[PDB]
């Protein structure tokens, strides 16, 4: 439809900002020429080849929500390994919006994490007894940490990388739709798959049919499945792998 040609300068610029905080608000990458380099990483992190453009999948996704988590760190002292070394992973539920009951929340993000535990010999185990790794909180950034709210739009849920018993707990923007039954905002399961992801150090993939495929295509799904590519991208580190196998 070629929307772009009747978009204003402050939807272009707008741009600038939407990906600025993608990866930190930081002014190191503030220059008019930079633009054609940032993007350029931009669009190959995505995946979508229209490189060096801003208007036709470019535009679409910095509107569309996907997730909260930046894409890119620096800190020392990091834990072993990216993904979970250890022999085992626990998580727990900390509160449960109103859109969904408990017992839905509780058995979506465990139907996703146990999704990507079952392609690799990493083990699980259920929590019945004191606090877990993963902790699943629903929050606004102003509840106790940095980043901020951003509200509905923009930015669906920040996650932490697995570091010490604090950090790995994943969070869900309370202000974001949440649903599954209904099928209308955002599915939990599908979010769920990505958001825990990032709990196993995952990162984003470029592959059309991914599962932390970033381009989100809007709409929920009925089943859900797990990608071939972050299959196969997750087991070059865990060397063996259980090829999914699900109902
Ligand atoms: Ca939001
Ligand atoms: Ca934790
Ligand atoms: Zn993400
Ligand atoms: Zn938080």
Known sequence: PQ?????????????????????????????????????????????????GMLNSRVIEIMQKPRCGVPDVAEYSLFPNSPKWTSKVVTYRIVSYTRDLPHITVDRLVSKALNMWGKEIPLHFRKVVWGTADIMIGFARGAHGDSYPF????????????????????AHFDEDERWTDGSSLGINFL?????????????????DPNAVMYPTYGNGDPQNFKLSQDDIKGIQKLYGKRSNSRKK
């Open 3 to 51: 929307e772009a040609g009747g978009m204003s300068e402050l939807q272009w610029e707008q741009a600038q900002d939407y990906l600025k905080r993608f990866y930190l608000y930081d002014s190191e990458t503030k220059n008019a020429n930079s633009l054609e380099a940032k993007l350029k990483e931009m669009q190959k992190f995505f995946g979508l080849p229209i490189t």
């Open 150 to 169: 951003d509200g509905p739009g923009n930015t669906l849920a920040h996650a932490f990388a697995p570091g010490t018993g604090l950090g790995g707990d």
């Open 190 to 206: 599908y979010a769920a798959t990505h958001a825990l992801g990032h709990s196993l150090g995952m990162g984003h993939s470029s």
